[PDB]
PDB file of C-alpha atoms and ligand atoms in Angstrom:
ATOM      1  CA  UNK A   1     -62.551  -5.522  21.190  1.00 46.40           C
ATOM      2  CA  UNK A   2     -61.107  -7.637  19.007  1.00 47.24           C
ATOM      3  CA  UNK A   3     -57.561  -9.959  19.314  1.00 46.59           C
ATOM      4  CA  UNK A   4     -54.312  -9.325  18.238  1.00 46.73           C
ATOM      5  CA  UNK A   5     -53.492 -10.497  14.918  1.00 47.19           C
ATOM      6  CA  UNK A   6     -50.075 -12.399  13.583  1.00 44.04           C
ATOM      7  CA  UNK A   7     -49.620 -10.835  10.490  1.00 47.73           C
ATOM      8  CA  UNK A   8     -46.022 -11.094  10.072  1.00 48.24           C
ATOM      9  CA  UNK A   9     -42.216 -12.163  11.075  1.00 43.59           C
ATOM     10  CA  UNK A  10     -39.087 -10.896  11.515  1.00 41.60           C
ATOM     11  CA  UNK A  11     -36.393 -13.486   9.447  1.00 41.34           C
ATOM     12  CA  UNK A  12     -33.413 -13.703  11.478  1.00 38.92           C
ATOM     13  CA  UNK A  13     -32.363 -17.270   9.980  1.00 36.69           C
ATOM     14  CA  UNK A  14     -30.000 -16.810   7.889  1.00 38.96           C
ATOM     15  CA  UNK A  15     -27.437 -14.327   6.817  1.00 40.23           C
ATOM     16  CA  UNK A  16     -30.010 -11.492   6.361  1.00 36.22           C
ATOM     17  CA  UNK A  17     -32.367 -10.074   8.440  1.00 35.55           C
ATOM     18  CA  UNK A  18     -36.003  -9.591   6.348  1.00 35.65           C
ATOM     19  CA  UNK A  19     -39.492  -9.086   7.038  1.00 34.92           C
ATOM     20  CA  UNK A  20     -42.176 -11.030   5.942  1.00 33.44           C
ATOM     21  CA  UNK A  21     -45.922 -10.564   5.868  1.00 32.43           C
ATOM     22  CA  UNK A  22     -48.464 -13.696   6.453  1.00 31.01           C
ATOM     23  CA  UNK A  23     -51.781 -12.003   6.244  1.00 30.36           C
ATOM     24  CA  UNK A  24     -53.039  -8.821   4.373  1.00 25.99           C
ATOM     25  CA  UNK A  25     -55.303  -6.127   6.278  1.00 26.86           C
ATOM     26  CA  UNK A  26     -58.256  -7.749   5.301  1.00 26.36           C
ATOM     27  CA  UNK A  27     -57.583 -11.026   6.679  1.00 28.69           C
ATOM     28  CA  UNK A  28     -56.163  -9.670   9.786  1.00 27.78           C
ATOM     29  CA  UNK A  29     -59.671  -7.504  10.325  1.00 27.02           C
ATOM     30  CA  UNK A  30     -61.594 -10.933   9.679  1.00 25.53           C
ATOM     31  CA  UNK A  31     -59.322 -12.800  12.178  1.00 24.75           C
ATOM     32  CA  UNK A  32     -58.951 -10.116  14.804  1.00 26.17           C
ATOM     33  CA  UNK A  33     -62.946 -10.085  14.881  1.00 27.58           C
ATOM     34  CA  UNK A  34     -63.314 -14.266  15.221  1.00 26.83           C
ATOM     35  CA  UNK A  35     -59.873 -14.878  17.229  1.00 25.88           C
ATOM     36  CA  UNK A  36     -59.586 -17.705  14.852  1.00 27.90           C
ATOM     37  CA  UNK A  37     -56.084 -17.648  12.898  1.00 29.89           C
ATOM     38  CA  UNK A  38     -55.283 -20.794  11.109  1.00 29.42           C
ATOM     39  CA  UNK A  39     -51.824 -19.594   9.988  1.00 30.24           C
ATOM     40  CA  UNK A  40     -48.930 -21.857  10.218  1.00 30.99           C
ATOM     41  CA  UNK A  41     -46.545 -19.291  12.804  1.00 32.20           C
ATOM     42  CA  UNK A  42     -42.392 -19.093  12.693  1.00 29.07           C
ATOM     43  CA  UNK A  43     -40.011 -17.425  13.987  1.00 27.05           C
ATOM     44  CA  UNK A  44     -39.016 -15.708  17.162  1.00 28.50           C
ATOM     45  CA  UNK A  45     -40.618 -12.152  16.604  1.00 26.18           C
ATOM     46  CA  UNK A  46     -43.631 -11.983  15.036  1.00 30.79           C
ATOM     47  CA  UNK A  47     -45.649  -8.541  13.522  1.00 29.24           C
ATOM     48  CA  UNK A  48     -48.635  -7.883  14.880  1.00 30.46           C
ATOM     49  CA  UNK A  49     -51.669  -5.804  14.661  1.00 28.80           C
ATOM     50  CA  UNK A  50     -55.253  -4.555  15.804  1.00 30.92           C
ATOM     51  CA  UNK A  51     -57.852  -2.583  14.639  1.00 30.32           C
ATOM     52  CA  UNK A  52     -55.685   0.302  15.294  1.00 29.60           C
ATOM     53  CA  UNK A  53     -52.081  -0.285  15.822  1.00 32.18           C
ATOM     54  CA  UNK A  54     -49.436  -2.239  14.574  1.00 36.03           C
ATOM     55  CA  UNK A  55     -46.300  -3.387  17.018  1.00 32.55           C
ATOM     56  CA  UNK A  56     -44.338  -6.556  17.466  1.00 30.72           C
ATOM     57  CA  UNK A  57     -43.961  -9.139  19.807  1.00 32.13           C
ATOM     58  CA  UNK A  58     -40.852 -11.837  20.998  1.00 32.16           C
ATOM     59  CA  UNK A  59     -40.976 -15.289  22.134  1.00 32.40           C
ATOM     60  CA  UNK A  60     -38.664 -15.554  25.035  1.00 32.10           C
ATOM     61  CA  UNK A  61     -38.726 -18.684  27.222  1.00 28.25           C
ATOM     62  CA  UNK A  62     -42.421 -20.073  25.541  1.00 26.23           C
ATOM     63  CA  UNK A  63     -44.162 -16.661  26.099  1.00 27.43           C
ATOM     64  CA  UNK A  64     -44.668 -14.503  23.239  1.00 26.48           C
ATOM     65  CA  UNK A  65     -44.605 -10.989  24.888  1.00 26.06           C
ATOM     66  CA  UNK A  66     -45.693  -7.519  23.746  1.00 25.29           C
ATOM     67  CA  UNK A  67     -46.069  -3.408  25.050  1.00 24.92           C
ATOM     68  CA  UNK A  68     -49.439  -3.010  27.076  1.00 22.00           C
ATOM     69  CA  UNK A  69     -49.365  -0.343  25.220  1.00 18.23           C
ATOM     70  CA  UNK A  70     -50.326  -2.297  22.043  1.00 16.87           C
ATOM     71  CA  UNK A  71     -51.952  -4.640  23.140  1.00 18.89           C
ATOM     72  CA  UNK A  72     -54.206  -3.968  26.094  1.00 18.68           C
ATOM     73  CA  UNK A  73     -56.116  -6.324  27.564  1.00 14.24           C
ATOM     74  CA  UNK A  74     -56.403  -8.510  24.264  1.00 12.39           C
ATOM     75  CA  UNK A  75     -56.712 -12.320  23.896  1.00 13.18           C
ATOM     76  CA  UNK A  76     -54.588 -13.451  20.827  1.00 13.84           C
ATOM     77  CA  UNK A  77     -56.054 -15.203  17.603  1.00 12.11           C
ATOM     78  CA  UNK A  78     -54.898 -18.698  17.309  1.00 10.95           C
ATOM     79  CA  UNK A  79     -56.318 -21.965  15.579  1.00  7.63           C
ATOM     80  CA  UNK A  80     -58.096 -22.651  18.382  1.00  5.86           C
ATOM     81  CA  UNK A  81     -60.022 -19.416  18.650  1.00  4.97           C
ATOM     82  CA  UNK A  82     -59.355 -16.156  21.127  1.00  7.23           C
ATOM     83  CA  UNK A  83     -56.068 -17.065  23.910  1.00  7.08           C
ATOM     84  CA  UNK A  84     -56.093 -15.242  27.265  1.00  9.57           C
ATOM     85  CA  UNK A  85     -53.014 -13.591  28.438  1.00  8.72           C
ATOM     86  CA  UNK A  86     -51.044 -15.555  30.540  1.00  9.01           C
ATOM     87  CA  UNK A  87     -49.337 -12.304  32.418  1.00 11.17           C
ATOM     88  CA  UNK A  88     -50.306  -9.101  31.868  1.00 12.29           C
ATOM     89  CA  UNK A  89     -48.202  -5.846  34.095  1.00 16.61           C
ATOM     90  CA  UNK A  90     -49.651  -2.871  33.285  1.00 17.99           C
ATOM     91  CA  UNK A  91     -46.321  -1.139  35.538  1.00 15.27           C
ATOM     92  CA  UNK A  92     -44.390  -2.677  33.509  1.00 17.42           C
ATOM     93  CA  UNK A  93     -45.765  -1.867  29.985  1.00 17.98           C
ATOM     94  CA  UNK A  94     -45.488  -5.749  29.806  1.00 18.22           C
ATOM     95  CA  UNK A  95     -48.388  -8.516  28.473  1.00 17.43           C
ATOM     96  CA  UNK A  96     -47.618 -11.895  27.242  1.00 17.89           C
ATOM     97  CA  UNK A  97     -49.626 -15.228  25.778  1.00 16.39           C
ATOM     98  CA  UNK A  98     -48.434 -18.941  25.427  1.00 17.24           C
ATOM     99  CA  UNK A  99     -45.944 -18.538  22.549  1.00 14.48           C
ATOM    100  CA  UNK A 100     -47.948 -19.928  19.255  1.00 12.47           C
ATOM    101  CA  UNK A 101     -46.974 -23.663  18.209  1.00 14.65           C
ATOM    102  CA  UNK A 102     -44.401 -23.180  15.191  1.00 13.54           C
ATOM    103  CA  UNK A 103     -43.164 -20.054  17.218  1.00 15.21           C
ATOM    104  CA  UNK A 104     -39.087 -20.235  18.105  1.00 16.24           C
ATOM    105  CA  UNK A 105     -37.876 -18.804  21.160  1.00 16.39           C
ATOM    106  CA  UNK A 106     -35.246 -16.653  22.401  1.00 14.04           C
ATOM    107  CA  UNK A 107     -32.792 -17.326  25.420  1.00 14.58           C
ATOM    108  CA  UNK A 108     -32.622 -14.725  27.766  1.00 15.66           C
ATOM    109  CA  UNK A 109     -29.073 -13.391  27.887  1.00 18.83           C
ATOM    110  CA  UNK A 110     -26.677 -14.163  30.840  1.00 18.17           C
ATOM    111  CA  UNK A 111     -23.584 -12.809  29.505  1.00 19.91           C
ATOM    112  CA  UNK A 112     -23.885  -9.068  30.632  1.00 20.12           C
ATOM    113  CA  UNK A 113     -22.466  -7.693  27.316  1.00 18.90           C
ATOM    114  CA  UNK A 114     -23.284  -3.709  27.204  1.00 20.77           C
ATOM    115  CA  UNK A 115     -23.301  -4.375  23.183  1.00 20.62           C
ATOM    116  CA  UNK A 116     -26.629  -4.881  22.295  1.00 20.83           C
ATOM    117  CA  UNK A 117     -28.828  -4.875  18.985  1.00 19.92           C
ATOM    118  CA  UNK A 118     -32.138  -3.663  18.558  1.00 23.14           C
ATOM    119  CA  UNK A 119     -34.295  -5.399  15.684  1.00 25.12           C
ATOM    120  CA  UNK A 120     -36.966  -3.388  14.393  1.00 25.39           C
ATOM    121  CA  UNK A 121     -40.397  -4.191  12.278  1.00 25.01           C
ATOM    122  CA  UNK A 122     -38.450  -3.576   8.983  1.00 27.10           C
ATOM    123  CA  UNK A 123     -35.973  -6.000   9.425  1.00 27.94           C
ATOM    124  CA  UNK A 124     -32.899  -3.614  10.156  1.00 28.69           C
ATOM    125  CA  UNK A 125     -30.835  -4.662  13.206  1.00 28.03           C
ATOM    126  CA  UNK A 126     -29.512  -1.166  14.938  1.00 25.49           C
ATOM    127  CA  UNK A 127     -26.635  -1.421  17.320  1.00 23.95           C
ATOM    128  CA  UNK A 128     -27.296   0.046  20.550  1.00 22.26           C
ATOM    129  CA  UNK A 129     -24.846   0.510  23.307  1.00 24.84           C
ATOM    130  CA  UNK A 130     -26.433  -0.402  26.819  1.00 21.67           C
ATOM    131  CA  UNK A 131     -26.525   2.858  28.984  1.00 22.55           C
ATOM    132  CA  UNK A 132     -28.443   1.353  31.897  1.00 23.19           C
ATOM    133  CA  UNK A 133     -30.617  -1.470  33.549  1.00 24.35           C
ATOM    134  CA  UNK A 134     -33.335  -0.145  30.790  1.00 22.83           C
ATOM    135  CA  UNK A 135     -31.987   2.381  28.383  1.00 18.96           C
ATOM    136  CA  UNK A 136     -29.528   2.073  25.205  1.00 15.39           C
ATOM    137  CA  UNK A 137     -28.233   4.769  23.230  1.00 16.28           C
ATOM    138  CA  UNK A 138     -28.387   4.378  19.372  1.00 17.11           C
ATOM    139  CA  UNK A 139     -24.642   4.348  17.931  1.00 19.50           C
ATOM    140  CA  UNK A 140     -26.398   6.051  14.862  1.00 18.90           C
ATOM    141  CA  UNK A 141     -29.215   8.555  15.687  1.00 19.21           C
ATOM    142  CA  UNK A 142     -32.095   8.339  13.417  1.00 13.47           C
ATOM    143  CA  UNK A 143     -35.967   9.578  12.892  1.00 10.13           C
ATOM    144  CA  UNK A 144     -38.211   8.491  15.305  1.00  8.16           C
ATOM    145  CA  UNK A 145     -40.140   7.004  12.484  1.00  5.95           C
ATOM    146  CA  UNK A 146     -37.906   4.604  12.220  1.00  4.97           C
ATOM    147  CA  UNK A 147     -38.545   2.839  15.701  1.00  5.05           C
ATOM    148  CA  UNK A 148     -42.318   3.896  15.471  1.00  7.16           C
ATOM    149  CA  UNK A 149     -43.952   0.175  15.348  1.00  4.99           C
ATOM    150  CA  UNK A 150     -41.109  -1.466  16.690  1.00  2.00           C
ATOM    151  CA  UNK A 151     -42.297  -1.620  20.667  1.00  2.00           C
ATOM    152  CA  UNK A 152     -42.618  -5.452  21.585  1.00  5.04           C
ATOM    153  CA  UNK A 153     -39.703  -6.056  19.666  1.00  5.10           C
ATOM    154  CA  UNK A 154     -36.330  -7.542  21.223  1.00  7.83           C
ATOM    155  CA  UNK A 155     -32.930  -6.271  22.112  1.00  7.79           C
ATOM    156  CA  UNK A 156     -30.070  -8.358  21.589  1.00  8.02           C
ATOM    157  CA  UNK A 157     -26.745  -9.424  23.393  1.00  6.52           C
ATOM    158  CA  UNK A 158     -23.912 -10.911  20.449  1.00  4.16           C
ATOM    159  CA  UNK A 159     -24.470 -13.847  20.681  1.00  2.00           C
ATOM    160  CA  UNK A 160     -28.548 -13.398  20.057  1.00  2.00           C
ATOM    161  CA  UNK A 161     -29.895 -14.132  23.168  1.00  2.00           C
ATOM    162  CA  UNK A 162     -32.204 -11.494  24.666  1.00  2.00           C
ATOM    163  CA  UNK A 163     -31.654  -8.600  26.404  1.00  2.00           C
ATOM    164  CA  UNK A 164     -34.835  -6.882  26.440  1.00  2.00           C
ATOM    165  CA  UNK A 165     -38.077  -6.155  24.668  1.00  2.00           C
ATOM    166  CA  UNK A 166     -38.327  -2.810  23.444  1.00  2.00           C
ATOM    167  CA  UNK A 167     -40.953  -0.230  25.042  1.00  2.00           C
ATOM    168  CA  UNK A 168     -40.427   3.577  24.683  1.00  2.00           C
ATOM    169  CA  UNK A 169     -38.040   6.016  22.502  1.00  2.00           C
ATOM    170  CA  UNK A 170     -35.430   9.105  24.053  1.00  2.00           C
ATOM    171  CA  UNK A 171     -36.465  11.683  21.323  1.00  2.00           C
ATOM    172  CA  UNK A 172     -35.021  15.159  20.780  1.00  2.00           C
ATOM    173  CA  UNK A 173     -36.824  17.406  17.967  1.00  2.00           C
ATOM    174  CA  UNK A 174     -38.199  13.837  16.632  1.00  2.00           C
ATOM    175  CA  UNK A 175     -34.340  12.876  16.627  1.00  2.00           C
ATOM    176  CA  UNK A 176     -33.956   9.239  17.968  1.00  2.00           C
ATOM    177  CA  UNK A 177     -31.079   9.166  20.388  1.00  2.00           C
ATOM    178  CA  UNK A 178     -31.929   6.151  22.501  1.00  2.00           C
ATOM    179  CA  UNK A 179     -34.173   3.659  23.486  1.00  2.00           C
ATOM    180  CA  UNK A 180     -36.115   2.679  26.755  1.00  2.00           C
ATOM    181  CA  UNK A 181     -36.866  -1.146  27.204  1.00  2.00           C
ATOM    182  CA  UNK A 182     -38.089  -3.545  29.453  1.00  2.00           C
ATOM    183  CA  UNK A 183     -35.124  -6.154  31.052  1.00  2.00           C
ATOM    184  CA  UNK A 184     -35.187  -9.512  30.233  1.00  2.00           C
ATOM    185  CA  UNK A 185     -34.753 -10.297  34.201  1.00  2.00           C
ATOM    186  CA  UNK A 186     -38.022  -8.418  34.625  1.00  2.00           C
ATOM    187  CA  UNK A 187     -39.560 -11.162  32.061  1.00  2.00           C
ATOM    188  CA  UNK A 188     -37.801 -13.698  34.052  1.00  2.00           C
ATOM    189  CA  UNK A 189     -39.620 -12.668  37.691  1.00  2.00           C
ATOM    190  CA  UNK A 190     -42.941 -12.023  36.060  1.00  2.00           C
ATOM    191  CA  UNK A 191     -42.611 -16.146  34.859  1.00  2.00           C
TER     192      UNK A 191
HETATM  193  C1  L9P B   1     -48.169   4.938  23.438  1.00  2.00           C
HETATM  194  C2  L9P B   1     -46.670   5.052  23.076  1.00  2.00           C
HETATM  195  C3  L9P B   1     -45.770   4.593  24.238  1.00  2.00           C
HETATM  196  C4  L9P B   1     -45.849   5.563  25.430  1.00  2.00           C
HETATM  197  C5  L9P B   1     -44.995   6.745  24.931  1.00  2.00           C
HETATM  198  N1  L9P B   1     -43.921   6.069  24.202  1.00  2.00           N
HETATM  199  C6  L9P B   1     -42.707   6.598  23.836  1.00  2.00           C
HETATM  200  O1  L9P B   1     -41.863   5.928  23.233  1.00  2.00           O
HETATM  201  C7  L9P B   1     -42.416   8.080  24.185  1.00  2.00           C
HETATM  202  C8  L9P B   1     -42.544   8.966  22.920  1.00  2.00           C
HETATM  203  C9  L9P B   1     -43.957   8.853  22.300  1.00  2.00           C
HETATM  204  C10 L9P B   1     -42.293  10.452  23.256  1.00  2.00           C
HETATM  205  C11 L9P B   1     -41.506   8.553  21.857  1.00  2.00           C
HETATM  206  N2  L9P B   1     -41.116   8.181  24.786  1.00  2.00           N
HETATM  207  C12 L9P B   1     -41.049   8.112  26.135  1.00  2.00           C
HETATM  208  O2  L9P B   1     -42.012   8.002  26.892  1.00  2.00           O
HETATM  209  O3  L9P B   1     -39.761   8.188  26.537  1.00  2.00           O
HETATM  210  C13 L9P B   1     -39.567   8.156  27.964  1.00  2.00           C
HETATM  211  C14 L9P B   1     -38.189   7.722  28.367  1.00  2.00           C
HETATM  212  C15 L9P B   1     -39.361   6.794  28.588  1.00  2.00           C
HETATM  213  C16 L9P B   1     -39.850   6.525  29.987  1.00  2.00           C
HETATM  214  C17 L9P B   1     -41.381   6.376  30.000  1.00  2.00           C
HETATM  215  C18 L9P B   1     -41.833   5.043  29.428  1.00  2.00           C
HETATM  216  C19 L9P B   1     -43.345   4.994  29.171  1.00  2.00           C
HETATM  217  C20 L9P B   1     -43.775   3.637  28.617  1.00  2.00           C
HETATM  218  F1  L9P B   1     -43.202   3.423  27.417  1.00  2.00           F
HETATM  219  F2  L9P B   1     -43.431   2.701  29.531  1.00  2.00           F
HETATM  220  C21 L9P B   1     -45.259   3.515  28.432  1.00  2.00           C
HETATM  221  N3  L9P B   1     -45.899   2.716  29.320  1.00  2.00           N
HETATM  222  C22 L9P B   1     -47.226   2.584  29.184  1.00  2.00           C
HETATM  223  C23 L9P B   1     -47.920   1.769  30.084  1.00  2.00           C
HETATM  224  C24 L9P B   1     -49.296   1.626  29.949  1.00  2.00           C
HETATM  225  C25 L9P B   1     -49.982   2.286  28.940  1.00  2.00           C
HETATM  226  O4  L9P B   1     -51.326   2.080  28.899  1.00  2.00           O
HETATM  227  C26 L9P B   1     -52.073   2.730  27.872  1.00  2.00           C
HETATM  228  C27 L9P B   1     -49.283   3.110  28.034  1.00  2.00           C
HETATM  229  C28 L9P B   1     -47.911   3.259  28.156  1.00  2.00           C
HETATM  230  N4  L9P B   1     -47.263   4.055  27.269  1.00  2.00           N
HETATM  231  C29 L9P B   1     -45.930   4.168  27.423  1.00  2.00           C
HETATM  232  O5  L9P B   1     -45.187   4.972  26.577  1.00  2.00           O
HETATM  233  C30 L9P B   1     -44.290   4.657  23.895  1.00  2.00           C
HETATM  234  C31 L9P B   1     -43.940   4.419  22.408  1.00  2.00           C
HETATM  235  O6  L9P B   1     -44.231   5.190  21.495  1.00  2.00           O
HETATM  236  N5  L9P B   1     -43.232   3.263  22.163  1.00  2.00           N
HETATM  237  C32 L9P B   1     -42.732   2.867  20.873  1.00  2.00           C
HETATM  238  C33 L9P B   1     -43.571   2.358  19.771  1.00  2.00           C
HETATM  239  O7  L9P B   1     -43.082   2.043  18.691  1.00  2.00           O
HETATM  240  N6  L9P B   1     -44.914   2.240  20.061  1.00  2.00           N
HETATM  241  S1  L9P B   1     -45.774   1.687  18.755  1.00  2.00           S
HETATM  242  O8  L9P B   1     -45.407   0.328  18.345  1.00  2.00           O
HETATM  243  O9  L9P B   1     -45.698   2.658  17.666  1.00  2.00           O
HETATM  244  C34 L9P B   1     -47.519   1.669  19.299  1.00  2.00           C
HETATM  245  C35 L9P B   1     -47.823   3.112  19.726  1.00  2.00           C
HETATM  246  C36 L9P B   1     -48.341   0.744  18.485  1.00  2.00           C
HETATM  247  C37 L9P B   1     -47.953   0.354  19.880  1.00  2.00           C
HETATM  248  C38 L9P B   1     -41.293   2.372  20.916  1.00  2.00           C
HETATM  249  C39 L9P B   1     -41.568   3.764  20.450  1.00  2.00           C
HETATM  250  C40 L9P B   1     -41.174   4.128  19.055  1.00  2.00           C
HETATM  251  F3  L9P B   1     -42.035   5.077  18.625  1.00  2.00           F
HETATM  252  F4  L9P B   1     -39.946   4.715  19.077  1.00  2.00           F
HETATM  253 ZN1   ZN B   2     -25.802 -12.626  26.023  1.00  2.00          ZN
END
């Protein structure tokens, strides 16, 4: 099988929140196959893609994490060629790698604020009130198409350190009314 694949960022540096592609399908076939990617990398949460799916993944604490479900097993493309996972919790839905050089990371949150913000792969930022140690209800109920693509991604406290890294959707006749995610503190025992 072949590596996951950068091929994109979230942009949360400024005022608005925007995505941004680095690499076209092509290129990301091409680099998934070699595990070489010579991209320049930014950014707390990157897109990212295989042969067959497309999710996202968060840099907390110099690991760049992502859903097992996405991921698998995979080694990540980097300059230097294919990079073995560094933890990998198959329980936990949970895999991560070395965050990429260039990468940013995110601060796990110690505030305990119940007001959290979930930041999906098309750049919108969707308020979610914290319901429990790993579910949130959406303050506006959408499609699950919405969140479809968005696993990996982060939850955030106000103050934009992390809460959580998305994993699974509460769905009600394809209604999202809540999301499932995996705790920042469980990040913090797997390092
Ligand atoms: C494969 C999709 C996983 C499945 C089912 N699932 C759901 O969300 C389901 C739906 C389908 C009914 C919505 N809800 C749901 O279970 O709710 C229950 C309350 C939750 C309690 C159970 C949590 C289960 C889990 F999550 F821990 C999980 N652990 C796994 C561990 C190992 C593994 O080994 C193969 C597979 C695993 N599979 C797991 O879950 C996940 C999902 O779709 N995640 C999102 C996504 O975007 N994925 S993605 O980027 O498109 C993609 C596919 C390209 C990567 C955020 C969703 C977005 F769509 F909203
Ligand atoms: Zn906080």
């Amino acid at each position: 099988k072949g590596s996951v694949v950068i091929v994109g960022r979230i942009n949360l540096s400024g005022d608005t929140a925007y995505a941004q592609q680095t690499r076209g399908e092509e290129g990301c076939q091409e680099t998934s196959q070699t595990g070489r990617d010579k991209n320049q990398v930014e950014g707390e949460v990157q897109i990212v893609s295989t042969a067959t799916q497309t999710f996202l993944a968060t840099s907390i604490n110099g690991v760049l994490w992502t859903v097992y479900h996405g991921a698998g097993t995979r080694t990540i493309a980097s300059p230097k060629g294919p990079v073995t996972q560094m933890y990998t919790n198959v329980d936990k839905d949970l895999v991560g790698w070395q965050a990429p050089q260039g990468s940013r990371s995110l601060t796990p949150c110690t505030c305990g604020s119940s007001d959290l913000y979930l930041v999906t792969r098309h750049a919108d930022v969707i308020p979610v009130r914290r319901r429990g140690d790993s579910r949130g209800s959406l303050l506006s109920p959408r499609p699950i198409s919405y969140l479809k693509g968005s696993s990996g991604g982060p939850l955030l406290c106000p103050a934009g350190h992390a809460v959580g890294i998305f994993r699974a959707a509460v769905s009600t006749r394809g209604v999202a009314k809540a999301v499932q995610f995996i705790p920042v503190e469980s990040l913090e025992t797997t390092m």
